[PDB]
Design a protein around this motif. Structure first.
Motif, mmCIF file in Angstrom:
data_model
loop_
_atom_site.group_PDB
_atom_site.id
_atom_site.type_symbol
_atom_site.label_atom_id
_atom_site.label_comp_id
_atom_site.label_asym_id
_atom_site.label_seq_id
_atom_site.Cartn_x
_atom_site.Cartn_y
_atom_site.Cartn_z
ATOM 1 N N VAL A 1 0.841 -1.190 0.000
ATOM 2 C CA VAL A 1 0.000 0.000 0.000
ATOM 3 C C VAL A 1 0.878 1.242 0.000
ATOM 4 O O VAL A 1 0.635 2.196 -0.749
ATOM 5 N N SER A 2 1.922 1.241 0.828
ATOM 6 C CA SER A 2 2.806 2.393 0.903
ATOM 7 C C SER A 2 3.675 2.485 -0.341
ATOM 8 O O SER A 2 3.969 3.586 -0.814
ATOM 9 N N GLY B 1 -3.596 7.553 -3.767
ATOM 10 C CA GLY B 1 -4.022 7.492 -2.384
ATOM 11 C C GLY B 1 -4.023 6.072 -1.840
ATOM 12 O O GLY B 1 -3.959 5.083 -2.571
ATOM 13 N N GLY B 2 -4.107 5.981 -0.510
ATOM 14 C CA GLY B 2 -4.084 4.678 0.142
ATOM 15 C C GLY B 2 -5.284 3.807 -0.187
ATOM 16 O O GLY B 2 -5.143 2.602 -0.418
ATOM 17 N N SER B 3 -6.486 4.397 -0.182
ATOM 18 C CA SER B 3 -7.693 3.647 -0.522
ATOM 19 C C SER B 3 -7.667 3.159 -1.965
ATOM 20 O O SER B 3 -8.050 2.018 -2.251
ATOM 21 N N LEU B 4 -7.206 4.005 -2.886
ATOM 22 C CA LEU B 4 -7.084 3.578 -4.273
ATOM 23 C C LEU B 4 -6.022 2.492 -4.435
ATOM 24 O O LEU B 4 -6.160 1.612 -5.290
ATOM 25 N N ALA B 5 -4.972 2.524 -3.616
ATOM 26 C CA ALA B 5 -3.964 1.467 -3.656
ATOM 27 C C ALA B 5 -4.549 0.128 -3.231
ATOM 28 O O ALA B 5 -4.223 -0.911 -3.814
ATOM 29 N N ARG B 6 -5.395 0.133 -2.200
ATOM 30 C CA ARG B 6 -5.950 -1.114 -1.685
ATOM 31 C C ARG B 6 -6.850 -1.792 -2.709
ATOM 32 O O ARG B 6 -6.812 -3.021 -2.855
ATOM 33 N N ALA C 1 -6.575 -1.334 -5.929
ATOM 34 C CA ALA C 1 -5.666 -1.708 -7.006
ATOM 35 C C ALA C 1 -4.941 -3.010 -6.695
ATOM 36 O O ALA C 1 -4.755 -3.854 -7.580
ATOM 37 N N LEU C 2 -4.506 -3.183 -5.448
ATOM 38 C CA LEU C 2 -3.813 -4.411 -5.084
ATOM 39 C C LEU C 2 -4.746 -5.614 -5.152
ATOM 40 O O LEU C 2 -4.344 -6.697 -5.597
ATOM 41 N N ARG C 3 -5.991 -5.449 -4.704
ATOM 42 C CA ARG C 3 -6.920 -6.574 -4.685
ATOM 43 C C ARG C 3 -7.341 -7.005 -6.086
ATOM 44 O O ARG C 3 -7.680 -8.175 -6.292
ATOM 45 N N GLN C 4 -7.310 -6.094 -7.062
ATOM 46 C CA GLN C 4 -7.610 -6.480 -8.438
ATOM 47 C C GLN C 4 -6.389 -7.006 -9.173
ATOM 48 O O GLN C 4 -6.491 -7.993 -9.912
ATOM 49 N N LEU C 5 -5.241 -6.347 -9.012
ATOM 50 C CA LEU C 5 -4.038 -6.804 -9.693
ATOM 51 C C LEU C 5 -3.719 -8.243 -9.313
ATOM 52 O O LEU C 5 -3.166 -8.994 -10.125
ATOM 53 N N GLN D 1 -1.394 -5.289 6.689
ATOM 54 C CA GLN D 1 -0.210 -5.382 5.846
ATOM 55 C C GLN D 1 -0.471 -6.343 4.698
ATOM 56 O O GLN D 1 -0.907 -7.475 4.921
ATOM 57 N N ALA D 2 -0.194 -5.890 3.479
ATOM 58 C CA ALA D 2 -0.334 -6.696 2.271
ATOM 59 C C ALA D 2 1.036 -6.774 1.606
ATOM 60 O O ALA D 2 1.525 -5.779 1.058
#
Ligand SMILES: [Mg+2]
Ligand SMILES: [Mg+2]
Ligand SMILES: [Mg+2]
Ligand SMILES: [Mg+2]
Ligand SMILES: [Mg+2]
Ligand SMILES: [Mg+2]
Ligand SMILES: [Mg+2]
Ligand SMILES: [Mg+2]
Ligand SMILES: [Mg+2]
Ligand SMILES: [Mg+2]
Ligand SMILES: [Mg+2]
Ligand SMILES: [Mg+2]
Ligand SMILES: [Mg+2]
Ligand SMILES: [Mg+2]
Ligand SMILES: [Mg+2]
Ligand SMILES: [Mg+2]
Ligand SMILES: [Mg+2]
Ligand SMILES: [Mg+2]
Ligand SMILES: [Mg+2]
Ligand SMILES: [Mg+2]
Ligand SMILES: [Mg+2]
Ligand SMILES: [Mg+2]
Ligand SMILES: [Mg+2]
Ligand SMILES: [Mg+2]
Ligand SMILES: [Mg+2]
Ligand SMILES: [Mg+2]
Ligand SMILES: [Mg+2]
Ligand SMILES: [Mg+2]
Ligand SMILES: [Mg+2]
Lengths: 144, 62, 141, 72, 102, 140, 68, 84, 206
Positions: free
Chosen positions: D29-30, D39-44, D46-50, D65-66
């Motif tokens: 996320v960081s 942003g942090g919410s957009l990262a989360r 993005a990570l769950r789809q990627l 932590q992801a």
RNA sequence: GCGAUAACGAACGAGACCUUAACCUACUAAAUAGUGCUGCUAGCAUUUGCUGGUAUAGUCACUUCUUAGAGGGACUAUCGAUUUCAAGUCGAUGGAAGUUUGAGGCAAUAACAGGUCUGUGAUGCCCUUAGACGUUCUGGGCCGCACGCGCGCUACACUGACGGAGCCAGCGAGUAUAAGCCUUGGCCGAGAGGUCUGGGAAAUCUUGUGAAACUCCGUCGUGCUGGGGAUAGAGCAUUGUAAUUGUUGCUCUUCAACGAGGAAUUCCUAGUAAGCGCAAGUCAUCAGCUUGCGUUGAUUACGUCCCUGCCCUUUGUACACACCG
């Protein structure tokens, strides 16, 4: 449930009830900028307007924005409980109300002279700028 | 050029507050040239502690 | 060998029973679920507005399964938490009575629980039957 | 006050994400916030789809932590 | 009204007389062929009172911590009611009080 | 009946009573398998008595424990002690003592608390402070 | 520290001057013997006296002790 | 209720009796030294292991004082003071 | 090597542990060695543990801390600053996540990097003060192996703690950045600036 | 304590002692504690298995877990070092316990113008004693606010806030013709709270006090922000004769200083410190307070006289009401 993109639809700055709202704030917490609208109240008007809370302020369309300001100005018409309101059992007409950005300080003010006009003890300490709720003053509130 | 010196004898607590200890060190290689040095942390015998400089003795501390 | 509720992790079992209870749709949901907060010590309503009642009813059903004649007063204490008194220290405060009482009353007419003798609410003859079923459809993946 | 991280995903940044994230030893996320300026919410999300799209392999799963790595 | 399941409850502050009365009743319930259950040691209750030492409010804040231990024992007997009561008079002790409940 | 031994493990206040019976190797915590203990980050504390000796030791015995008192962490240490003590106590009674002394050797060489209960208890609080040793801040 | 007191030091050495043949180098045997030789008011003092008597007995076999 | 009056066997070993007796002498104007030694010897005569008497207050003088009169063996600390 | 069938089923991956004891069943102690002769007896890696949580009595005697597992001494130092005291379960989570980040970066054994970061962060000579009631009289003295090891843990966790304050980077990955840089001796990392500055001041006192 | 020794042999105090905590598959029993079996009974796969309910007549079995009485157990035990080879100290091994085993209770010879006559139907003397300084009733005040100081509570965030979910203690307390105790369970109420029954003078019921930190999964994303929740407006309940100068609780709204704190200064060495709550006292109501209890649980010494305080020896003294001389 996945990342989506948009172009030209986002609105950076909103204007609701003559108050400027940052468009990149989530909708539930953007309305808390409007004075008289707290987190608890903003959670319900979005849920009564079928505006899912997962949207930023600029994501909303004009149709949705007008649907929210309508509900806030007429809460009881949308199954919003009386006890949930800002100004319930009003002094003059006895009905349940929810005052908003510009109306709040006017009727908050009208309550102050109404306390001061009858020269009650609570109104007097309000006039002096002291605590009115019985709090001790010998050792606290020494700033300016 | 650091040199390692195993300690062989704990002499006693020295210094004003007693926070530093006199100790008798012996080199791992060339088991001679035994020197008396002062050490800050807690020390038992047979602790392998390295010396940034070797050519200096120690005496009682203030 | 068989499968019981005690043989499946609690956290993801409730997420499975909640999903079934929403899709089944026969559970009666009171009209204030979109307005109310779970506890007087809470400061905000649940974030899962559409599904929080189902998951809580699922949690209530599982908790009653493992015990004997738990009342509704005990349910308020269980889901209650530390209140955020402003400058005073924190304290434990019970959850709302209506939300728990409506769930057990709602669960009583869906067939999973019933009023037990000597107080409390027992699990029904069919309450054991259908919870053990959901456990099986939980651990196949 | 100087952050001003982007919270709405346009098209120029979207394909830049899919062009830059694969070339990372370690994404989080960081890491997404630090280098992609999102942003942090957009990262989360993005990570769950990627991860769902197979570009990213999940090293460790946790709410706070992801830990992810490249799938190549 | 003959042979009954009879409870004798023993409470006192001091254990020496409590165990003597308890043992003496058990002894008399042995030579007399009366089936018995006990004695049952109930969890002792510690009555604690914590006051300030100072009659005034001057000095270091020092506290007394007084205690009053209460020990309770119940013994179950299977005998007619006339027999159990006369056993009580045999094993009467000033410190220990006795209550009999059917 | 059958070959049954009953033991217990303890931590600060937590006490776990273990029943070790002859069987297919059933190991439950308050009626739930040990593979689903809530403190996930500590799940290996109760896995230690298993993998140390080898799961083959549990083929013939089944273990059901009931842990009460203490706290979440204090209960984990109580459970692992009841299991370790239960396996040893069964061998001493229904197997040769040569095997019982073998199991006890691996356990003690790894962790004393597997077999020996920790004797640490909370110190009483004394007046003049908010804790056992802590005192109210002093002013002059 | 573990410094024995005078009530145990002088009472233990009176035993050696009085019952040396019956004493021994074993604490467990000595502990039982002193319960029939001396009237000790508390169990803790009985083991303490015998535990120092054992130390003196262990020391007498290595040479002469002062005070006995 | 039934009340019985029983004589104390060893009057010298009862500090309550000795303190009340001393008060009845002090209130008769008897000197303190003669009164204090009257309980020191009476307690010891009964067989007490030890005795100590402290009298505090004011006597003709404006300032108050206390005087201790010990004798024999006295213990001070621990449980035995609650027993003997 | 055999899979052992019990009535209470045991997952396949966790059974892969009777052969070898590994940290979190993922990290092996076999290939870990202290790259300093002087700290071998005070970095305890000889007894493997599964999780850095043993709840042992290492504060009774004087040198019992040297017998505590090195990872457990590290997770002990994380729970600081009042609000974190006693939160060991949280501390274990940071260490568990930190090792994975240390594994995806540089691909080395994460606990080997931890040992390297500790030997490289402890100052070998610190200048103690010998002031005679107020006057400044600095004197250069040597550093014991034990204080050298345990100040490294103090400086490493302090640097990681401050790097995660008011920063989007999480504490587990702030610890990973602090540990990785100090392991390779980079002067960019905290606790390497401190170690050099301590050994630098000692050079200005002899 | 060893030892040196014009001393020898002793007493108080210390230590011994008492209470509490940790061990006992070795005794004694327990339907107010628990368990296995066994009756009867439920759910899931059918292999006879796995989870339960029920059980004050199954007129069962047992005391490991629980309780407490009689005892046992640790005495620095054994072995290595140092030492005047003495008192002892440090390491290992065994052990439940090897820091006086952990913690307390008691605690000497004298003394202070230390504090209390606002604890006493404890007191000498002085004052007052009917327009009382007695006592009672009504109302206010003890909270009053330009300010200085001390004991503390919240916080300044992401090792986090919320939102769901998981869900574990111990110390204790509890009533009657009252003047009303602890209160489950059911039913209303968003809440606070209300109502109807029942249990408990208590290992039985409240109560496993299902406590909070904590853990999992989500939202938030470095922003005075969803940190923080003062101040205040409007409204809803409880206690009380009586809440105004808001007793307390609840609902909506307002959302301030505070972005880790100068000179200084406090407490603390292992289940300790720190968090985190719970109970008991005060108590019609009110706990940011104490007295305890338990949950999670460390960093760093195990050393010294450098600062500070106290003790001892020597010394000076014109002090002995003893330097407040
Ligand atoms: Mg809870
Ligand atoms: Mg909760
Ligand atoms: Mg808070
Ligand atoms: Mg708060
Ligand atoms: Mg004495
Ligand atoms: Mg004493
Ligand atoms: Mg952070
Ligand atoms: Mg004495
Ligand atoms: Mg029964
Ligand atoms: Mg049955
Ligand atoms: Mg003691
Ligand atoms: Mg005075
Ligand atoms: Mg004075
Ligand atoms: Mg008076
Ligand atoms: Mg008076
Ligand atoms: Mg009074
Ligand atoms: Mg008058
Ligand atoms: Mg006052
Ligand atoms: Mg006022
Ligand atoms: Mg104070
Ligand atoms: Mg939470
Ligand atoms: Mg109970
Ligand atoms: Mg507020
Ligand atoms: Mg704000
Ligand atoms: Mg000081
Ligand atoms: Mg009041
Ligand atoms: Mg209270
Ligand atoms: Mg007070
Ligand atoms: Mg002189």
């Amino acid at each position: 449930p996945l990342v989506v993109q948009e172009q030209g639809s986002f609105q950076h700055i909103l204007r609701l009830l003559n108050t400027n709202i940052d468009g990149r704030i989530k909708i539930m917490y953007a309305l808390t900028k409007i004075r008289g609208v707290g987190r608890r109240y903003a959670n319900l008007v979005c849920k009564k307007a079928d505006v899912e809370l997962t949207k930023r302020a600029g994501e909303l369309t004009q149709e949705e924005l007008e649907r929210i300001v309508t509900i806030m100005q007429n809460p009881t018409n949308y199954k919003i409980p009386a006890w949930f309101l800002n100004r319930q059992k009003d002094q003059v007409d006895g009905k349940d109300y929810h005052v908003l950005a510009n109306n709040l300080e006017s009727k908050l003010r009208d309550d102050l002279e109404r306390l001061k006009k009858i020269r009650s003890h609570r109104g007097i300490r309000h006039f002096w700028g002291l605590k009115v709720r019985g709090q001790h003053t010998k050792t606290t509130s020494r700033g300016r | 050029p650091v040199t390692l010196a195993k300690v062989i004898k704990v002499l006693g607590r020295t210094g004003s507050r007693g926070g530093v200890t006199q100790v008798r060190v012996e080199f791992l290689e060339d088991a001679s040239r035994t020197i008396v040095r002062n050490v800050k942390g807690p020390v038992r015998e047979n602790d392998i502690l390295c010396l940034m400089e070797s050519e200096r003795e120690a005496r009682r501390l203030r | 060998p068989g499968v019981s509720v005690r043989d499946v992790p609690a956290q993801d079992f409730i997420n499975a029973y909640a999903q079934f209870l929403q899709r089944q749709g026969k559970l009666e949901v009171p009209g204030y679920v979109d307005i109310v907060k779970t506890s007087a010590g809470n400061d905000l309503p649940p974030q899962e507005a559409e599904t929080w009642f189902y998951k809580r009813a699922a949690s209530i059903a599982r908790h009653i399964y493992l015990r004997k004649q738990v009342g509704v007063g005990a349910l308020n204490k269980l889901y209650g938490g530390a209140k955020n008194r402003g400058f005073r220290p924190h304290k434990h405060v019970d959850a709302s009575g209506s939300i728990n009482r409506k769930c057990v009353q709602a669960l009583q007419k869906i067939g999973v629980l019933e009023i037990s003798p000597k107080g409390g609410r027992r699990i029904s003859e069919n309450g054991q039957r259908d919870l053990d079923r959901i456990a099986a459809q939980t651990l196949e993946e | 006050d100087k952050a001003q991280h982007i919270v709405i995903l346009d098209q120029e940044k979207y394909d830049r994400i899919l062009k830059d994230v694969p070339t990372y030893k370690y994404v989080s996320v960081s890491v997404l916030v630090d280098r992609l300026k999102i942003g942090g919410s957009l990262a989360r999300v993005a990570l769950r789809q990627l991860e769902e799209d197979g570009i990213i392999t999940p090293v460790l799963k946790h709410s706070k932590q992801a830990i992810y790595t490249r799938a190549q | 009204q003959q042979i009954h399941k009879i409870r004798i409850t023993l409470t006192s502050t001091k254990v020496k007389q409590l165990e003597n009365v308890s043992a003496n009743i058990i002894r008399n319930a042995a030579q007399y062929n009366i089936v018995k259950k006990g004695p049952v040691r109930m969890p002792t209750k510690v009555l604690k009172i914590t006051t300030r030492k100072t009659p005034n409010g001057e000095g270091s804040k020092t506290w007394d911590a007084y205690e009053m231990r209460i020990h309770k024992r119940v013994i179950d007997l299977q005998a007619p009611a006339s027999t159990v009561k006369r056993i009580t008079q045999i094993t009467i002790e000033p410190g220990v009080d006795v209550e009999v409940t059917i | 009946s059958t070959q049954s031994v009953q033991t217990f493990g303890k931590k600060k206040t937590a006490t776990a009573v273990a029943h070790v019976k002859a069987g297919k190797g059933l190991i439950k915590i308050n009626g739930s398998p040990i593979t689903l203990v809530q403190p996930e980050i500590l799940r290996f504390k109760v896995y230690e008595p298993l993998t140390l000796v080898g799961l083959d030791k549990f083929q013939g015995i089944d273990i059901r424990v009931k842990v009460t008192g203490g706290g979440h962490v204090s209960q984990v240490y109580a459970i692992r002690q009841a299991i370790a003590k239960g396996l040893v106590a069964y061998h001493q009674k229904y197997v040769d003592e040569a095997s019982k002394n073998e199991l006890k050797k691996i356990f003690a060489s790894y962790d004393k608390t597997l077999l020996v209960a920790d004797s640490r208890r909370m110190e009483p609080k004394k007046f003049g402070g908010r804790g056992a040793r802590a005192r109210f801040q002093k002013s002059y | 520290g573990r410094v024995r007191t005078k009530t145990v030091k002088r009472a233990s050495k009176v035993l050696i001057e009085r019952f040396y043949p019956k004493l021994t180098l074993d604490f467990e045997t000595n502990k039982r013997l002193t319960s029939e030789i001396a009237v000790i008011q508390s169990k803790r003092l009985r083991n303490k006296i015998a535990g120092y008597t054992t130390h003196l007995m262990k020391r007498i076999q290595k040479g002469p002790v002062r005070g006995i | 209720i039934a009340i019985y009056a029983e004589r104390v066997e060893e009057r010298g070993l009862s500090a309550a009796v000795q303190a009340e007796a001393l008060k009845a002498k002090l209130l008769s104007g008897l000197p303190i030294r003669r009164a204090a030694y009257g309980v020191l010897r009476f307690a010891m005569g009964a067989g007490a292991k030890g005795v100590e008497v402290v009298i505090s207050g004011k006597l003709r003088a404006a300032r108050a004082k206390s005087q201790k009169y010990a004798d024999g063996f006295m213990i001070h600390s621990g449980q035995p003071t609650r027993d003997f | 090597l055999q899979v052992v069938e019990l009535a209470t089923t045991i997952p396949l991956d966790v059974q892969e542990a009777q052969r070898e004891v590994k940290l979190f069943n993922k990290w092996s102690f076999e290939d870990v060695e202290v790259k300093d002769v002087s700290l071998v007896d005070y970095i305890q890696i000889r007894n493997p543990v599964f999780v850095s949580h043993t709840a042992g009595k290492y504060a009774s005697k004087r040198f019992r801390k040297a017998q505590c597992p090195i990872v457990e001494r590290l997770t002990n130092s994380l729970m600081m600053n009042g609000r974190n005291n006693g939160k060991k379960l949280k501390a274990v989570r940071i260490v568990k996540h930190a090792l994975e980040i240390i594994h995806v970066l540089t691909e080395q054994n994460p606990i080997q990097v931890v040992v390297d970061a500790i030997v490289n962060s402890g100052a070998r000579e610190d200048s103690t003060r010998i002031g005679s009631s107020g006057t400044v009289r600095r004197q250069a003295v040597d550093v014991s192996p034990l204080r050298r090891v345990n100040q490294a843990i103090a400086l490493l966790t302090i640097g990681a703690r401050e790097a995660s304050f008011r920063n989007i980077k999480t504490i587990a990955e702030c610890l990973a950045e602090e540990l990785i840089n100090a392991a390779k001796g980079s002067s960019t990392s905290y606790a390497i600036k401190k170690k050099d500055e301590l050994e630098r001041v000692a050079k200005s006192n002899r």
